[PDB]
């Protein structure tokens, strides 16, 4: 019983620590894919300032026409 | 009534309860004593699982008895915390967090001291006694460390 | 042996947290997935647009020499 | 011979092995019967951890004897599979594993049959015989599932 328990004691402990180590593998994958996303976002703003800069280009010119 | 609440590691520790608190309040009275967030803590009571709405009394726990507290992983919000070299720290916090209590966080887990760290969010510099809700901070928001 | 027995329930205790936790875990990163997929697919439009945008420049200043 | 395996949720399996099966060998038996990939898998026999390329006769494991399976909850490399309504699934998957693989995968874990699963990745349709490798499929790359349905 004392042999007994103390096995289940060694599994579980083992457990609990497999258990951790996943979670701290989880968590670093996580902050990698935020990371990721926060690339992403300055990906977005820089192709909405391109649009916006384009966008006035195009009316600019049809303007610069229209002044001839 | 007085109990002793104690880890798997050797800490124990000492708490002024009454037998209507529940368990909500006792977690919310260790978090006073030793700053674990409630949302990190699990009771635990003859093997079982002690639930936030229930009193002591539904336990049948009586004076100098010993809970059993269990940390967990996580809590419920997380942030991310950026360096300017693209390293990524997450942050076990709540939403009362003080910008403050963020800082010593970084401290505890980087080594920087909070006086030479300057935290961004939203491209505006964040002030020590306001809070994270008081920006609008939300789980999974991000930012930006910069050093002094 | 009391002493041992406390230390296995308040373990397997330990081991049904931590699962939690990881799950928790889990379904915060697949829900960081699916945010990345939908900024990756704002990217695309984006792309489009400046593709877009930058033909009609080109041909308006192609449509303007040729007059 | 016939060894038993016992999870510590109580979940007790009957293998049919030989004496001087790798461990590698038992833990395949383990994945064609439950769910569970060869590197989530962990197994003890008095108290020793037993090495993938070690033998039941190396361990003095005799006929009818008990292994303790310990788990993990991940390996290490997991893609995630959206369906068309949103839904995200993430697969634990290894760079050798074939589409057919992945497919019984989602089958175990959403009941979908692989027969009607079409997975796309990268605007191609990928081939049932081929591997996650032979695409280019990287660790986090997303999959995504569509259905046919006759």
Same mark, same amino acid.
């Not at chain 1, 103390?6 to 180590?21: A, D, M, Y």
């Not at chain 2, 002793?4 to 002024?16: C, D, R």
């Not at chain 2, 006086?115 to 491209?123: E, H, P, T």
């Given at each position: 019983?004392?042999?007994?328990?103390?096995?289940?004691?060694?599994?579980?402990?083992?457990?609990?620590?497999?258990?951790?180590?996943?979670?701290?593998?989880?968590?670093?994958?996580?902050?990698?894919?935020?990371?990721?996303?926060?690339?992403?976002?300055?990906?977005?703003?820089?192709?909405?300032?391109?649009?916006?800069?384009?966008?006035?280009?195009?009316?600019?010119?049809?303007?610069?026409?229209?002044?001839? | 009534?007085?109990?002793?609440?104690?880890?798997?590691?050797?800490?124990?520790?000492?708490?002024?309860?009454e037998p209507?608190?529940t368990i909500?309040?006792?977690?919310?009275?260790?978090?006073?004593?030793?700053?674990?967030?409630?949302?990190?803590?699990?009771?635990?009571?003859?093997?079982?699982?002690?639930?936030?709405?229930?009193?002591?009394?539904?336990?049948?726990?009586?004076?100098?008895?010993?809970?059993?507290?269990? %940390?967990?992983?996580? #809590?419920?919000?997380?942030?991310?915390?950026? =360096? *300017?070299?693209?390293?990524? $720290?997450?942050? !076990?916090?709540?939403?009362?967090?003080?910008?403050?209590n963020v800082?010593?966080?970084?401290?505890?887990?980087?080594?920087?001291?909070?006086?030479?760290?300057? %935290?961004?969010?939203? #491209?505006?510099?964040?002030?020590?006694?306001? =809070? *994270?809700?008081?920006?609008? $901070?939300?789980? !999974?928001?991000?930012?930006?460390?910069?050093?002094?």
């Open positions: 019983r004392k042999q007994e328990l103390v096995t289940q004691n060694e599994l579980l402990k083992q457990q609990v620590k497999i258990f951790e180590e996943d979670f701290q593998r989880e968590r670093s994958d996580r902050e990698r894919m935020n990371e990721e996303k926060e690339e992403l976002k300055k990906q977005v703003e820089k192709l909405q300032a391109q649009v916006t800069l384009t966008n006035a280009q195009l009316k600019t010119l049809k303007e610069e026409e229209k002044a001839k | 009534m007085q109990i002793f609440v104690k880890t798997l590691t050797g800490k124990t520790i000492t708490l002024e309860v209507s608190d909500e309040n006792v977690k919310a009275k260790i978090q006073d004593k030793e700053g674990i967030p409630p949302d990190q803590q699990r009771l635990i009571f003859a093997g079982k699982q002690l639930e936030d709405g229930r009193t002591l009394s539904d336990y049948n726990i009586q004076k100098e008895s010993t809970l059993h507290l269990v %940390l967990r992983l996580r #809590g419920g919000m997380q942030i991310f915390v950026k =360096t *300017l070299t693209g390293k990524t $720290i997450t942050l !076990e916090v709540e939403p009362s967090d003080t910008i403050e800082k010593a966080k970084i401290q505890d887990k980087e080594g920087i001291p909070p006086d030479q760290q300057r %935290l961004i969010f939203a #491209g505006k510099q964040l002030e020590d006694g306001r =809070t *994270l809700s008081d920006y609008n $901070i939300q789980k !999974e928001s991000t930012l930006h460390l910069v050093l002094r």
